[PDB]
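Follow-up to my post from last week.
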Amino acid sequence: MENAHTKTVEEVLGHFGVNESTGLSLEQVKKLKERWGSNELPAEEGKTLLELVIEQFEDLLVRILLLAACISFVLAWFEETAFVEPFVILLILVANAIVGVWQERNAENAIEALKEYEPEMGKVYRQDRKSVQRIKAKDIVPGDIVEIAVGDKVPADIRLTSIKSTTLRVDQSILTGESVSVIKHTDPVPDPRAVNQDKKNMLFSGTNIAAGKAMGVVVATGVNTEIGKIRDEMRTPLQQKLDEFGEQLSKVISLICIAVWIINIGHDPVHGGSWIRGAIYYFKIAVALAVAAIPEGLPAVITTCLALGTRRMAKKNAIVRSLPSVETLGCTSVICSDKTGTLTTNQMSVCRMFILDRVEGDTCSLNEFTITGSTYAPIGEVHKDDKPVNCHQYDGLVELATICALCNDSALDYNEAKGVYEKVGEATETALTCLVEKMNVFDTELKGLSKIERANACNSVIKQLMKKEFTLEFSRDRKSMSVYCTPNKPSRTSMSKMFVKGAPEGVIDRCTHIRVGSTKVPMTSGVKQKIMSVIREWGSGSDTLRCLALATHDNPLRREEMHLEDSANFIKYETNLTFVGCVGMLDPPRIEVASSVKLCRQAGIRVIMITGDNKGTAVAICRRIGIFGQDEDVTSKAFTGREFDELNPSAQRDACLNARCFARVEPSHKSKIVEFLQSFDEITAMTGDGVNDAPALKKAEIGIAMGSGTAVAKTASEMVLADDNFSTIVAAVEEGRAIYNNMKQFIRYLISSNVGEVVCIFLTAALGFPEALIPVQLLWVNLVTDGLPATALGFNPPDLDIMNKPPRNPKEPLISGWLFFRYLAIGCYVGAATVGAAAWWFIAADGGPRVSFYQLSHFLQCNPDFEGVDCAIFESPYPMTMALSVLVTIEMCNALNSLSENQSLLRMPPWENIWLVGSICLSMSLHFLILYVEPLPLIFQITPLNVTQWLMVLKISLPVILMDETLKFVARNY
Ligand SMILES: Nc1ncnc2c1ncn2[C@@H]1O[C@H](COP(=O)(O)OP(=O)(O)CP(=O)(O)O)[C@@H](O)[C@H]1O
Ligand SMILES: [Ca+2]
Ligand SMILES: [Ca+2]
Ligand SMILES: [Mg+2]
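User reply:
Got it. Predicted complex:
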C-alpha cells in the first residue's frame, strides 16, 4: 500500500483489519511478517579493505616521502644498490601504515559489537494483552497499533491515528534536516506527491518525539521505510595544533636540508670534475637527511591513538559517536550532571504519603502512611503506625488513588522473559501506578489475576468509573499536569473534575481549599506549613524522598469554554484547587557515583549537579554522594533557579565558580549555566538522561547520555554509556589525558633523536672530518630508528600518578620552553656521541691507525706534514659502520627515555610497554642482518663489527640514558 497520508484514519485501519483499541492478532502478525518481513536494515557498508589504506597515504608528510622514493627511483635508473634507496623509503612508509589499518579495523569491530548489543524495543497493542507491551523493534510489522510518547524513538513508519497530548512534536532532523521540532495532526493531507516535511500526519523511523504522546498504525517497516530508502546515500582540536606543528617543522628541515647542500658545494675531486655529477650526489644527501629528519609516522600515530581510545572505551561499554570527544574529555575542568536519571538509579516507588486528618483553626493533624515495595512490582502493602490498613476506609485515600491513576501517561508492563515489571513511560508516573496497585481503594478481588494483568489491574477499576476526556500535558515551566475527567455514572451528585499533580511548592500556591477525607475547607497558613515541613524532612531525611502534591478541581470550566491552543493557558485552568495529599518517592544514587566525585575532585574536576527537583532533595543527595560534606554550609554553594536570577552579576559570577548544586532549574537554565561555566574558559561536560537535558547536552563541549535514558537525549550527545556506569566518565577522562601524554613522548623521541641525526651531519662538516653517512644509510637509520620503534610509543601505560594532576589548558603552546631545551640537550649529545664513534677508530682505538688529530682535520691534504699515514685508509668502511651503529643504538636507548615524561626508568620499567620492546629488537635484528649476512654489507657500505667494537658502541650509547635520567630527576624534584 502506498500514499497512506492522503487517506483518512478510518481508511488506513480498515486496510489492515485492525481497530485502534485492541490491535493486531497473533495470526495477523505471522502473515504480515511473511508478506513484508522483519523490521530492520541489513548488514552495513562498513569499510572496504582499500579505503582504509588510501586515506592513510593521503597526507602532506607521507606524500613528500613518496616523492623522495620516486626521485631515488629515477636516479637509481641511471646508476651504471641505488634501487634500495626507494625501496627502503617505501619500507618505513608501509610499516607505519600497516599498524594504522589493523587498529582501525579491530576497533571498528568493537564499536559495532557494542552498539548492536541491547535490542531496540517498541510499544505495541496486540491482542494477547489488553494493555500496552513492548516488543523488539524488528517484530513490528505493517499493521499493528504502535504507541509513542516523549523522548521515544519512532520504531517504524506510522500513520498517526490519535494524539493523546494536546499537541505532539517531533524532531525529524535526521531525515529532513529540520533543526527545529515540528507539529503533527491526524487529519489527511491530500497532496499525494507531498514531500516528507509536509506529511504532517506521519512519523518516520529514526526520528524522536520532542513533546506529547500519540498512537498510530504502522504503514511501512524495514527497507520500505522513508529513512531506509536513503540508506545507500553517503578535524580534532589537537590535530589542528599538531598540523600547525607539522608544517612549521618541515620549514626548518627544508632550510637545514638546503643548508646541508650549500656547505659542501666545494667538494669535485672524487666525481670526475663534473659539477653536474658533483652536485647530484648531495641532493641525494639533502633528500636522505630530509627523509631521515621528517616525522613520517606523526600522522599515522595520531589516528592510531584515537582509534585505540575508541577501542578501549567500547570495552568499558561506552559508545563514542564523535571522534574528538575522548580527547576533549581529557581537558575537562568541570562536569555538570543531571540528578534523577543520571546520578540516580531511576528506580522509584512511593514509600510515604499523607492525606489530611482534621483541620481546626491554625492547627491540623494528618494521616501519614508508609508503603512497602522497593521495586516496580505491584506487590506491597500500606502501613499506618507500622500496621496494615484498608485504604478504602479513608475517603481521602480513595481520592489520592483516583488522582494517581487518572493523571498518568504511564503504565506497568510485565517482561515475562526477564520476570520483572518495567515502566511504559516515565519513572515518576510509574511509581504512582505501582502505588495505586498497592492501595486497592475499591477492595477489588485480585485473587486470580495473571502476573500480566496484575500490573494495571486496579488502575482500570478507576478508569472504568471515569471517562478521561482530555489531558493538559505536563510542562516544565508550570511544573504540573492536569486531566479533565467526567464520571461514567450519571451526573446529579457527581460532576466533572480536573485532577492535578505536580511539584508541591507550585501546586499548593494554587490550592485554595483542602480536602479533609470527605469534606472541603479553606486553605490556611498553618496547614501550608504542616505540608511544607513534612516535605522538608522527607527530602532531607535518610532516603532523600522525591515528592509531589495532588489536588482536585471541583468546579472546572466546560469542554467548550476552555481555550486549549496556547499552552500558557493551562496553568490558568488549574487555579481554584483542593489539596488532597502528597506522596514521597524513592530513588537511590547509583552505586559507583560517590567514588567518582572523589576521583574527580582529586583530578582537579569540579562536579556540579543541575536538576529540576526540590532544593532540599537536591542538596540532600549532594551530601550522600559527597559533593557536599554531611555538615558543610551550603548557603553560598547551592541555589535554586529564582535565587540565581535575583543576583548581581558580581556575586552571580561568584556563584558560577563556587556553587556545586543548582536546583529547580528549567532546560534553558541548564544551558545558561553551562554557558557561564564556559565564559570562564572552562571545558564543560554535561551528563543527562532526559528531554530537559537536551538543550544543555548540545551546549557542553562533551555531552554524555545515559544508556537507559531517552533517545532524544542520546541524539544530543557525543558519548553514550550503554552500561549506565558513571565510573566510565572518569575512565574516559584518564584515557584522554593518556593520549595527549603519548603524543609528547613520540615528539620527544623523534625530535631529540633526529636533531642528533642532523647535529652529527653539521658536526663532521665543521671539523672537516670525512663525511659520516651516504644516502642509503640515512635512509636506513630513517627506516630503522623512526619507524616501528617510534610508533610503539602509542601503547605506553598510564603514568603512575596520572589522575592526581589538574586538567591542562588547551590555550598552551604545544611544547614547553623547558621541553624544547630537553629535546636539544639530549639530541645535541646524540649528534656529538655518534661523531666521536668515527673519531674513536681514527685515534684512540687499537685497530685503527693512531692518526694525529691535525691529520684527521686536514685529511684532505695528504704529503710532508701528514706523513706516515696511508692515503686510502680515510675512506675505510670502518668509521661509517661505527657511527651508523652508535646512531641506531643511541636512538634505541633514547627510545626508552620516551616511556614516561618524568617517572624514572625504575618506577616505570621498560616491560610495562611490551610492544616498544619488540620493535627495538626487530630494528636491532634488521641492523644485525645487513651487518653480518653474506651479500648485504656491500650495498650499505658497512664492515661486520667484531666483538669488542660493540662494547665501545654500548659504552657510548648507554650514556644517553644516563643523561636523560638526570634530566628526569631535575624535572620532578622542582
Ligand atoms: N508527569 C509529571 N506530572 C506532574 N509533575 C511532574 C511530572 N514529572 C515531573 N514533574 C514535576 O516537575 C518538576 C520539574 O520537572 P523536571 O523534569 O524539569 O525535573 P525532574 O526532577 O522531574 C528530572 P531532573 O532531575 O532530570 O531535572 C519535578 O520536580 C516534578 O515535581
Ligand atoms: Ca624520518
Ligand atoms: Ca631517527
Ligand atoms: Mg532526569
